[PDB]
Design an enzyme around this catalytic site. Structure first.
Site, PDB file in Angstrom:
ATOM      1  N   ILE A 178       0.864  -1.279  -0.263  1.00 53.95           N
ATOM      2  CA  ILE A 178      -0.159  -0.204   0.035  1.00 53.95           C
ATOM      3  C   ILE A 178       0.354   1.251  -0.700  1.00 53.95           C
ATOM      4  O   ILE A 178       0.474   2.367   0.254  1.00 53.95           O
ATOM      5  CB  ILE A 178      -0.885  -0.355   1.468  1.00 53.95           C
ATOM      6  CG1 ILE A 178      -0.156   0.158   2.843  1.00 53.95           C
ATOM      7  CG2 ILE A 178      -1.650  -0.955   1.145  1.00 53.95           C
ATOM      8  CD1 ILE A 178      -1.549   0.169   4.132  1.00 53.95           C
ATOM      9  N   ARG A 231       5.266   2.401  -1.493  1.00 53.66           N
ATOM     10  CA  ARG A 231       6.508   2.483  -1.494  1.00 53.66           C
ATOM     11  C   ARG A 231       7.436   3.703  -1.671  1.00 53.66           C
ATOM     12  O   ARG A 231       7.152   5.549  -1.643  1.00 53.66           O
ATOM     13  CB  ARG A 231       7.297   2.374  -3.139  1.00 53.66           C
ATOM     14  CG  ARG A 231       6.135   1.329  -3.569  1.00 53.66           C
ATOM     15  CD  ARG A 231       6.421   0.259  -4.991  1.00 53.66           C
ATOM     16  NE  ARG A 231       5.095   0.070  -5.379  1.00 53.66           N
ATOM     17  CZ  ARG A 231       4.759  -2.037  -5.361  1.00 53.66           C
ATOM     18  NH1 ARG A 231       5.580  -2.561  -5.413  1.00 53.66           N
ATOM     19  NH2 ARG A 231       3.315  -1.998  -6.401  1.00 53.66           N
ATOM     20  N   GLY A 232       8.932   3.575  -0.162  1.00 51.17           N
ATOM     21  CA  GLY A 232       9.485   4.862  -0.752  1.00 51.17           C
ATOM     22  C   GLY A 232      10.914   4.432  -0.766  1.00 51.17           C
ATOM     23  O   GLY A 232      10.936   3.416  -1.338  1.00 51.17           O
ATOM     24  N   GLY A 233      12.041   5.505  -0.128  1.00 48.14           N
ATOM     25  CA  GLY A 233      13.229   4.610  -0.729  1.00 48.14           C
ATOM     26  C   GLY A 233      13.862   4.227   0.094  1.00 48.14           C
ATOM     27  O   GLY A 233      14.904   3.319  -0.602  1.00 48.14           O
ATOM     28  N   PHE A 234      13.621   3.773   1.503  1.00 44.90           N
ATOM     29  CA  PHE A 234      14.037   2.548   2.402  1.00 44.90           C
ATOM     30  C   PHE A 234      13.165   1.224   2.520  1.00 44.90           C
ATOM     31  O   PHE A 234      13.706   0.237   2.639  1.00 44.90           O
ATOM     32  CB  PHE A 234      14.507   3.239   3.403  1.00 44.90           C
ATOM     33  CG  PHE A 234      15.200   4.654   4.266  1.00 44.90           C
ATOM     34  CD1 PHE A 234      16.303   4.065   3.796  1.00 44.90           C
ATOM     35  CD2 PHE A 234      14.704   5.702   3.235  1.00 44.90           C
ATOM     36  CE1 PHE A 234      17.289   5.218   3.609  1.00 44.90           C
ATOM     37  CE2 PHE A 234      16.053   6.911   3.571  1.00 44.90           C
ATOM     38  CZ  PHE A 234      17.263   6.326   3.726  1.00 44.90           C
ATOM     39  N   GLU A 238       8.878  -0.902   1.849  1.00 47.86           N
ATOM     40  CA  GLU A 238       7.352  -0.955   1.701  1.00 47.86           C
ATOM     41  C   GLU A 238       6.150  -1.056   2.959  1.00 47.86           C
ATOM     42  O   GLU A 238       6.523  -1.088   3.742  1.00 47.86           O
ATOM     43  CB  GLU A 238       7.320  -1.604   0.250  1.00 47.86           C
ATOM     44  CG  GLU A 238       8.119  -3.338   0.581  1.00 47.86           C
ATOM     45  CD  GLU A 238       9.262  -2.602  -0.130  1.00 47.86           C
ATOM     46  OE1 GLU A 238       9.028  -2.288  -1.285  1.00 47.86           O
ATOM     47  OE2 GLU A 238      10.173  -3.680   0.133  1.00 47.86           O
ATOM     48  N   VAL A 239       4.914  -0.132   2.800  1.00 53.80           N
ATOM     49  CA  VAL A 239       3.848  -0.192   3.206  1.00 53.80           C
ATOM     50  C   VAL A 239       2.925  -1.501   2.896  1.00 53.80           C
ATOM     51  O   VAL A 239       2.597  -1.402   1.313  1.00 53.80           O
ATOM     52  CB  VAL A 239       3.375   0.568   3.735  1.00 53.80           C
ATOM     53  CG1 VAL A 239       2.757   1.078   4.650  1.00 53.80           C
ATOM     54  CG2 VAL A 239       4.423   2.186   3.722  1.00 53.80           C
ATOM     55  N   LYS A 260       5.481  -0.987   7.537  1.00 53.40           N
ATOM     56  CA  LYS A 260       6.205  -0.547   6.673  1.00 53.40           C
ATOM     57  C   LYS A 260       7.272  -0.703   7.610  1.00 53.40           C
ATOM     58  O   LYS A 260       7.848  -1.100   8.498  1.00 53.40           O
ATOM     59  CB  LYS A 260       5.910   0.400   7.676  1.00 53.40           C
ATOM     60  CG  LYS A 260       7.376   1.971   7.348  1.00 53.40           C
ATOM     61  CD  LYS A 260       7.015   3.381   7.406  1.00 53.40           C
ATOM     62  CE  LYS A 260       7.847   4.250   7.072  1.00 53.40           C
ATOM     63  NZ  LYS A 260       7.153   6.431   6.655  1.00 53.40           N
ATOM     64  N   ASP A 267       8.119  18.284   7.333  1.00 53.95           N
ATOM     65  CA  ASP A 267       8.011  17.827   6.618  1.00 53.95           C
ATOM     66  C   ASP A 267       6.737  18.095   5.918  1.00 53.95           C
ATOM     67  O   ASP A 267       5.861  16.747   5.040  1.00 53.95           O
ATOM     68  CB  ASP A 267       8.667  16.354   6.425  1.00 53.95           C
ATOM     69  CG  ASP A 267       9.383  15.952   4.668  1.00 53.95           C
ATOM     70  OD1 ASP A 267       9.264  16.938   4.255  1.00 53.95           O
ATOM     71  OD2 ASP A 267       9.376  14.467   4.699  1.00 53.95           O
TER      72      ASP A 267
HETATM   73  F1  LIG Z   1       8.916   2.916   3.829  1.00 50.86           F
HETATM   74  C1  LIG Z   1       8.300   4.004   2.843  1.00 50.86           C
HETATM   75  C2  LIG Z   1       6.751   3.448   1.994  1.00 50.86           C
HETATM   76  C3  LIG Z   1       6.324   4.467   1.689  1.00 50.86           C
HETATM   77  C4  LIG Z   1       6.106   5.548   1.715  1.00 50.86           C
HETATM   78  C5  LIG Z   1       5.477   6.500   1.002  1.00 50.86           C
HETATM   79  C6  LIG Z   1       6.171   7.033   0.179  1.00 50.86           C
HETATM   80  C7  LIG Z   1       4.861   7.844  -1.216  1.00 50.86           C
HETATM   81  N1  LIG Z   1       4.155   9.092   0.329  1.00 50.86           N
HETATM   82  C8  LIG Z   1       3.434   8.768   1.328  1.00 50.86           C
HETATM   83  C9  LIG Z   1       4.958   7.577   2.415  1.00 50.86           C
HETATM   84  C10 LIG Z   1       3.960   6.960   3.170  1.00 50.86           C
HETATM   85  O1  LIG Z   1       3.028   5.699   2.382  1.00 50.86           O
HETATM   86  C11 LIG Z   1       2.369   5.450   3.343  1.00 50.86           C
HETATM   87  C12 LIG Z   1       1.025   4.015   2.475  1.00 50.86           C
HETATM   88  C13 LIG Z   1       0.286   3.811   3.696  1.00 50.86           C
HETATM   89  C14 LIG Z   1       0.529   3.560   5.171  1.00 50.86           C
HETATM   90  C15 LIG Z   1       1.530   4.820   5.414  1.00 50.86           C
HETATM   91  C16 LIG Z   1       2.363   5.224   4.565  1.00 50.86           C
HETATM   92  O2  LIG Z   1       1.815   4.410   7.145  1.00 50.86           O
HETATM   93  C17 LIG Z   1       0.181   3.936   7.380  1.00 50.86           C
HETATM   94  O3  LIG Z   1      -0.220   2.738   6.175  1.00 50.86           O
HETATM   95  C18 LIG Z   1       7.411   6.385   2.482  1.00 50.86           C
HETATM   96  C19 LIG Z   1       8.410   5.561   2.868  1.00 50.86           C
END
Ligand SMILES: Fc1ccc([C@@H]2CCNC[C@H]2COc2ccc3c(c2)OCO3)cc1
Ligand SMILES: [Mg+2]
Lengths: 623, 57, 339
Positions: free
Chosen positions: A168, A170-173, A175-176, A191, A288
């Site tokens: 649900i 995706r980021g640099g480090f 996934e969720v 996460k 941020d």
């Molecule tokens: F490791 C990482 C994964 C995803 C990101 C995303 C990057 C884009 N913008 C939103 C960031 C956070 O995404 C979510 C999504 C669902 C969630 C959540 C956070 O907490 C509760 O359910 C950042 C970092």
């Protein structure tokens, strides 16, 4: 996968453990969710003198939640003219003259605020502390509190405790994922940050600071922040268990939907404002605030996410220029200039501008050079177009001031200033908090890649993992709330039956007597000894143990014991007892509060016994 | 201190003024007691297994 | 001064007592007994091992029926045994783990015990209901209970680390007489056969003869160079024996008012924990911290035998009233009946 409670004898260990920590007081137990729930059960069902006090308490607590003044005018009447009121006014420990005068004074004048009965709550509690509490402590509802508390304090999560589903975010480090906790069935977001990647990009301090900030913010059930219940890790992953948000971020949705009207913006601004207020009240600057960091749920309601860049300013206000460049306040861009929560009121204005225009107010013509965006913030005022209404203009003119000294939210009252803007003059902030307003954008069900960011040679040392050893966490409030709203009642009912059946059966079998009673037994419970699981009884001068079907036939005298030390065996902490004859005795406990208490009590026991035996001619060793 | 030392003086007065017999008389009476009860002592004069409750009585 | 005079007259009275004692020392018990035959060699076998205690045994006391005995242990229990069958009649867990002594009422209706709790607890053995229950907790000593001996079902004498002994009325729970005089922890007591007198042995290295009724100290007996851990009366009540940390037992005559004999061996360097006479008085049995019980000729002072069957300190012993057996108890957790 379900929760099995420890046996009630766990109380022997747990009560000492909790009492050493000062955790066995009225305030400490009553303010916990499971504590309150077991204490009310005791007072309602097992102690008449306390029953109507607790009934009334709960009526006042329902009254407090009534949304409209009309409801509260109706209900305050019903409560004052109620049977419980007449019970508590016509009894041995009634309400005071001034408490009744105060309430009756407000009540007669039809001023019915949510805290009308607060004088009554306070007097109720002054009467529940003392003998009624001590009677709860004696009861088997405190024993059951000890059983649950034991489980709480021995939580060691792994991935096998979760049924993980679709990605649900995706980021640099990492996934969720959408996931379900198997214990209770509660749905959560997981996460998973990847440790190999964290050392690569060198963001351990970011991974560690997100955990600390989440724990600072994850109490109080904020509906507008993505809060943590658990933090844990495995050999290659850091994992946060958070509020499930499977509706994508406002970056995806802004880009999909296009720009938002003032009305749609006003929904998101209201909910973000209440999220900030929460953090600022816990002395946390977010830093941020941008649309990628605003998540949506299934209904379109929003929460703030990703606290990695956030900072505690309760003891030392920060100075470092931290944030995303289209969204940083003047006082933040200037190193050496310290700032506090004022930084977020500037980033809100920037972000609220973006939702309307499609770009930060300081990113003219998509200017990608960061120095440009910085001097724009510092040097010029923003020309807000003629499209904007006079209210939206006074808001953003207020929020985007360069002076903290003249900036909306920073004149000494916080969010209550931004809430007072003419822009929000239609909003009832109670209805905002209660999430009663209809969202502008209900996300399409099961959409893909809706929460993505814009974007084998590495080995993890044991020195790297030493950074993450204080990472695991469980937020007590969150776990107790989760259990209460899922399995608490049924597990309590199953356990009552399972313990009832063990009592009857023990009656028939003849073994009624508790071997622990009428003596000077200090503590008792199960441990495994080197592996056989035995039930142990510590007395001042010896440690005895038994199996099932017999009273103890083996023991170890305190004068035999030379040292009690902690020791690792196959990734399990054990107690290594060194015995007089160059001999060893190793013990394994079923939970961490037990290891801690057993180590403490054995050390105290043998030191004190050997101290004493030495002053006794008949008992001590002679030449 | 002074109450204690008078207390001790009076005790020693009691202890000192008693009638003592010669050790030769005292010793003779003990010996004579033992000789008189010698045959009724089972640890001295071992009994038949028949009369011994820890064997065959 | 005033304390000058009291102190020097008290030392003058001590020379007087010593002078009077020496005036009586016309012959020794060993001279007097030269013509009686040696006892020969006392050799007993273990007839019973009493197994059940889970830790060190500190005390035992025989019943007047010469069959039942009570023992007290580091495991925080009294056990009452049938020595004939070895069966436990009662096993009594205690409220304090720090028990150090026990006693059997002559009637057989009660036992008593105590230790570091400073209390002498009385246990009714034949409750009207049928249970064994604590019937009285005699509080009053300000130190540990070292020994206690019943006079009947409503009177008990106790000795304590507070340096006193006391007579108690069990029904009222009150001390009837307090016996003050020892300057060290009292370690043992023994009742005279008539129960008009008793003797105590203390860590002040002295024994004292007390009048139970009048409550005073009649005679004080010195000689030992260290703690008297144990004391026992000669069967006719005119002498007693002590056992000490100095590795000797000694015989004191009450009427000659002095030591008659010393029982020792250069081999034997450990302390004595328990003493008892055989029925006729001819044997003195003593328990030692070297795991043995040595049997002495009380009249001639030779060692007649050894009972060597324990793997730790012999902490207690007792001969039955009928003379048939000795019980030894030990830090090895066993009692053995020898015969
Ligand atoms: F490791 C990482 C994964 C995803 C990101 C995303 C990057 C884009 N913008 C939103 C960031 C956070 O995404 C979510 C999504 C669902 C969630 C959540 C956070 O907490 C509760 O359910 C950042 C970092
Ligand atoms: Mg700065």
């Amino acid at each position: 996968k379900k929760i099995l409670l420890p046996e009630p004898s766990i109380r022997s260990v747990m009560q000492k453990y909790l009492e050493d920590r000062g955790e066995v007081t009225f305030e400490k137990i009553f303010s916990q969710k499971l504590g309150y729930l077991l204490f009310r059960d005791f007072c309602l069902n097992h102690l008449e003198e306390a029953r109507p006090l607790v009934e009334f308490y709960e009526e006042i607590k329902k009254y407090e939640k009534l949304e409209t003044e009309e409801e509260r005018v109706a209900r305050s009447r019903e409560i004052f003219d109620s049977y419980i009121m007449k019970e508590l006014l016509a009894c041995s420990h009634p309400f005071s003259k001034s408490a009744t005068e105060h309430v009756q004074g407000h009540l007669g004048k039809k001023q019915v605020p949510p805290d009308l009965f607060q004088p009554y709550i306070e007097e109720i509690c002054q009467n529940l502390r003392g003998d009624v509490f001590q009677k709860f402590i004696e009861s088997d509802k405190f024993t059951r509190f000890c059983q649950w508390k034991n489980v709480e304090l021995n939580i060691h999560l792994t991935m096998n405790d979760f049924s993980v589903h679709r990605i649900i975010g995706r980021g640099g480090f990492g996934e969720v994922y959408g996931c379900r906790k198997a214990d209770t069935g509660k749905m959560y977001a997981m996460k998973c940050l990847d440790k190999k990647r964290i050392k690569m990009k060198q963001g351990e301090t970011l991974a560690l600071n997100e955990r600390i900030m989440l724990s600072l913010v994850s109490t109080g059930d904020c509906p507008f922040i993505v809060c943590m219940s658990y933090a844990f890790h495995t050999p290659d992953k850091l994992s946060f268990i958070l509020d499930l948000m499977n509706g994508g971020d406002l970056h995806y949705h802004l880009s999909q939907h296009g720009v938002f009207s003032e009305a749609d913006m006003r929904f998101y601004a209201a909910e973000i404002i209440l999220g900030l207020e929460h953090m600022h009240n816990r002395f946390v600057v977010y830093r941020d605030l941008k649309p990628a960091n605003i998540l949506l749920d299934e209904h379109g309601h929003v929460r703030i996410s990703d606290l990695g860049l956030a900072c505690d300013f309760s003891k030392k206000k920060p100075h470092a220029s931290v944030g995303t460049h289209g969204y940083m306040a003047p006082e933040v861009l200037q190193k050496g200039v310290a700032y506090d929560s004022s930084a977020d009121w500037f980033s809100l204005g920037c972000m609220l501008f973006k939702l309307l225009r499609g770009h930060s107010p300081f990113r003219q013509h998509k200017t990608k050079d960061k120095h440009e965006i910085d001097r724009m913030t510092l040097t010029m005022a923003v020309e807000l177009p003629d499209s904007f209404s006079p209210e939206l203009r006074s808001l953003l003119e207020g929020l985007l001031q360069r002076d903290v000294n003249r900036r909306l939210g920073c004149l000494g009252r916080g969010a209550q200033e931004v809430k007072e803007s003419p822009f929000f003059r239609s909003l009832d902030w109670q209805m905002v908090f209660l999430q009663k307003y209809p969202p502008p954008l209900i996300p399409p069900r099961g959409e893909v890649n809706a929460a993505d960011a814009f974007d084998k040679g590495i080995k993890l040392l044991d020195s790297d993992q030493e950074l993450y050893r204080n990472f695991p966490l469980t937020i007590s409030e969150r776990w107790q709330q989760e259990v209460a709203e899922t399995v608490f009642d049924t597990i309590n009912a199953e356990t009552d039956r399972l313990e009832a059946r063990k009592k009857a059966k023990n009656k028939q079998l003849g073994h009624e007597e508790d071997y622990a009673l009428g003596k000077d037994c200090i503590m008792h419970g199960y441990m495994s000894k080197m592996w056989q699981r035995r039930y142990f009884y510590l007395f001042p001068n010896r440690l005895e143990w038994r199996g099932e079907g017999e009273a103890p036939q083996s023991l170890l005298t305190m004068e035999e014991i030379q040292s009690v030390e902690e020791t690792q065996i196959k990734e399990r902490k054990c107690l290594l007892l060194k015995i007089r004859g160059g001999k060893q005795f190793i013990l394994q406990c079923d939970s961490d509060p037990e290891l801690v208490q057993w180590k403490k009590e054995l050390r105290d026991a043998y030191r004190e016994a050997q101290q004493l035996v030495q002053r006794v001619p008949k008992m001590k060793n002679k030449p | 201190s002074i109450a204690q030392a008078r207390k001790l003086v009076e005790q020693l007065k009691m202890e000192a003024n008693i009638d003592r017999i010669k050790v030769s008389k005292a010793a003779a009476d003990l010996m004579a007691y033992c000789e008189a009860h010698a045959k009724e002592d089972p640890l001295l004069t071992p009994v038949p297994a028949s009369e011994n409750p820890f064997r065959e009585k | 001064s005033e304390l000058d005079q009291l102190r020097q007259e008290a030392e003058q009275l001590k020379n007087q007592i010593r002078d009077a004692r020496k005036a009586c020392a016309d012959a020794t018990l060993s001279q007097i007994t030269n013509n009686i035959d040696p006892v020969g060699r006392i050799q007993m076998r273990t007839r019973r091992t009493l197994r059940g205690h889970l830790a060190k045994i500190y005390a035992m006391h025989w019943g007047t029926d010469s069959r039942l005995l009570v023992s007290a242990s580091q495991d925080g229990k009294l056990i009452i045994w049938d020595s004939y069958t070895t069966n436990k009649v009662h096993a009594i867990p205690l409220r304090s783990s720090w028990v150090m002594t026990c006693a059997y009422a002559p009637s057989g209706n009660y036992v008593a015990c105590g230790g570091l709790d400073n209390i002498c607890s009385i246990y009714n053995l034949k409750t009207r209901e049928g249970n064994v229950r604590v019937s009285r907790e005699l509080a009053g000593h300000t130190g540990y209970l070292s020994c206690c001996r019943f006079l009947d079902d409503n009177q008990i004498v106790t000795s304590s680390g507070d340096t006193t002994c006391a007579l108690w009325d069990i029904e009222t729970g009150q001390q009837t007489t307090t016996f003050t005089g020892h300057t060290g922890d009292v370690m043992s007591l023994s009742l005279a056969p008539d129960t008009r007198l008793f003797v105590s042995g203390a860590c002040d290295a002295s024994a004292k003869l007390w009048d139970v009724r009048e409550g005073m100290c009649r005679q004080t007996f010195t000689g030992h160079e260290s703690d008297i851990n144990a004391i026992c009366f000669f069967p006719n009540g005119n002498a007693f024996a002590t056992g000490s940390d100095d590795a000797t037992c000694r015989l004191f005559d009450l009427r000659a008012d002095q030591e008659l004999m010393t029982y020792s061996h250069d081999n034997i360097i450990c302390g004595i924990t328990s003493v008892s006479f055989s029925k006729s008085g001819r044997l003195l049995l003593a328990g030692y911290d070297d795991f043995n019980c040595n049997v002495w000729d009380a009249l001639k002072a030779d060692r007649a035998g050894v009972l060597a069957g324990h793997d730790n300190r012999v902490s207690c012993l007792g001969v039955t009233d009928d003379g048939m057996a000795v019980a030894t108890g030990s830090w090895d957790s066993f009692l053995k009946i020898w015969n």
